[PDB]
Scaffold this active site. Structure first.
Site, PDB file in Angstrom:
ATOM      1  N   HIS B  41       0.809  -1.197   0.000  1.00 12.67           N
ATOM      2  CA  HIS B  41       0.000   0.000   0.000  1.00 12.67           C
ATOM      3  C   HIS B  41       0.862   1.275   0.000  1.00 12.67           C
ATOM      4  CE1 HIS B  41       0.163  -0.259   4.557  1.00 12.67           C
ATOM      5  NE2 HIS B  41       0.481   1.008   4.342  1.00 12.67           N
ATOM      6  N   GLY B 143       3.198   6.032   9.631  1.00 12.08           N
ATOM      7  CA  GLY B 143       4.529   5.977   9.085  1.00 12.08           C
ATOM      8  C   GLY B 143       5.322   4.779   9.562  1.00 12.08           C
ATOM      9  N   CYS B 145       4.362   1.643   9.174  1.00 10.42           N
ATOM     10  CA  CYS B 145       4.170   0.526   8.272  1.00 10.42           C
ATOM     11  C   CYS B 145       5.470   0.109   7.613  1.00 10.42           C
ATOM     12  CB  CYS B 145       3.149   0.877   7.197  1.00 10.42           C
ATOM     13  SG  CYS B 145       1.560   1.142   7.934  1.00 10.42           S
TER      14      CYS B 145
END
Ligand code: CL
Lengths: 306, 306
Positions: B41, B143, B145
């Site tokens: 993503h 942030g 991820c």
């Protein structure tokens, strides 16, 4: 979101950890530039520890009696000195992985990470607080002496602790990196009294703010209180007294949450007098005092290190 | 002595963490050999996340649309592919700090360390368990991820988790390093149901053994019980059932402490039915299930890594 007892990343410290052997005893040392720092009791046998005369024991030792290993790199000792309760071993090689670093003497209630090591190799990392009685509640086995505690600010490692002793009560005692003990302890195998261990109130409040930030607000009440009335209750439950300096340190958390410090204190007062009623806060059934206000701000804002 | 929620030393993982930018979105990637792994993503905008068609979004992207930074070393992407929910970015440079590593898909109840990162820089390390419902109770902000979970066995890093999502309930979901989600979750911003979160019984028992090893034995009783009678009670309190394989895994702790597994189970049964009475075990007022039997043996024996 979420909240965890988070340690600093340990990579910069891992590359500083070495094994130190003096005769039959082996522990951990910290290799910074061309000096290795380790507990002076590396020169003791098990028998010596009951009543060591460190100057006389050290007098029997020569540079070549100390074996320093970093992985499979043996370092040569070319000078040695005792500074308080640490030995400084001058070696022939500067550590190529020496970080930017400083030595700091922390105050009770400050937190730091411990890198637990054995035979100069890292085992695990955890976060803990210096208790008000200058002990730490660690996890240390035989051979972990010389393991270090540290903080990181951006790119600099602040070394604040070296592990020396387990007291007969199972709690841990150690020194700063200048070799001065935290607390009234000595590096002797003898019964030693730690003071009363009080709860670090400013840290509890910080963690209550963290709880609010993360959606746990059931404990918020619409009582208020004064600093004197609160300290009167704190002392009854063996909580450290709150000063104006502590109120100042909590200001940013007050501002972020809209909850004034004294209102948070009245919530705490109620939790002390009436308990938590089998309820939890941030997954805990006890009030937590191992987060400083700076730790909370750091974790809730995503600060990083280089 | 002492017992702490201990993470693995993070140094070997720190040197693998990079920043990945695709247009306006930046997250963390894992740089092993000449491949960067990151959440797919990274190619979504905030709007795209409500209902992304990943193949169509990825079709609009070219190698030069991805910016990979490791400190101040920009890496060049020369090939890219989507594998399940991860992107594999082929870069022109092999990571010089690539450890020995493997990718593993862990099972619920296993524990691992998370290195929480932002903009490719490490923030902190903590230990957690995969819950039986395949979520983790982490500490992650925007942030984070692409932050990874791992274990170490001697010299090898086993990567078992990559962070992808915070569910609307505040718990966290992610994938293995082959990009397959743990649990029934998808990388879409939509309401998603996690199952019932049960307590990991084999881990609780392990921690009770740890407690005994460390001098906390008040909870030991002279009742006993059977596996069927115990599972009948476990299920009432949303505890996972104990099987014979679990009894087998606890054997070494049984042997070290002289307390048979079923006797420990009867102690647990009593704690479940009668609570802890405002008493604690290893400093905790709740039963802890984030230590596996292997973690306990590792911490109580001083295992190290190279
Ligand atoms: Cl607790």
């Amino acid at each position: 979101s979420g909240f965890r007892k988070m340690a600093f990343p340990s990579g910069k410290v891992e590359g500083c950890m070495v094994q130190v052997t003096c005769g039959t005893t082996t522990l951990n040392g910290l290799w910074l530039d061309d000096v290795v720092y380790c507990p002076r009791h590396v020169i003791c046998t098990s028998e010596d520890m009951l009543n060591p005369n460190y100057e006389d024991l050290l007098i029997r030792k020569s540079n070549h009696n100390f074996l320093v290993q970093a992985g499979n790199v043996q370092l040569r000792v070319i000078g040695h000195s005792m500074q308080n309760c640490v030995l400084k071993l001058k070696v022939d090689t500067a550590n190529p992985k020496t970080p930017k670093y400083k030595f700091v003497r922390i105050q009770p209630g400050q937190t730091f990470s411990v890198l637990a090591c054995y035979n100069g190799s890292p085992s695990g990392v955890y976060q803990c607080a210096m208790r008000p009685n200058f002990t730490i509640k660690g996890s240390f086995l035989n051979g972990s002496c010389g393991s270090v505690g540290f903080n990181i600010d951006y790119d600099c490692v602040s070394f604040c602790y070296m592990h020396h002793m387990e007291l007969p009560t199972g709690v841990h005692a150690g020194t700063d990196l200048e070799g001065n003990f935290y607390g009234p302890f000595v590096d002797r195998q003898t019964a030693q009294a730690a003071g009363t261990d009080t709860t670090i109130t400013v840290n509890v409040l910080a963690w209550l703010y963290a709880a609010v930030i993360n959606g746990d607000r059931w404990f918020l009440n619409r009582f208020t209180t004064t600093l004197n009335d609160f300290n009167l209750v704190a002392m009854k439950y063996n909580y450290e007294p709150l000063t104006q300096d502590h109120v100042d340190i909590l200001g940013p958390l007050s501002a972020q949450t809209g909850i004034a410090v004294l209102d948070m204190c009245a919530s705490l007062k109620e939790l002390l007098q009436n308990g938590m009623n089998g309820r939890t806060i941030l997954g805990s059934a006890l009030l937590e005092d191992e987060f400083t206000p700076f730790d909370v701000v750091r974790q809730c804002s995503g600060v990083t290190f280089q």
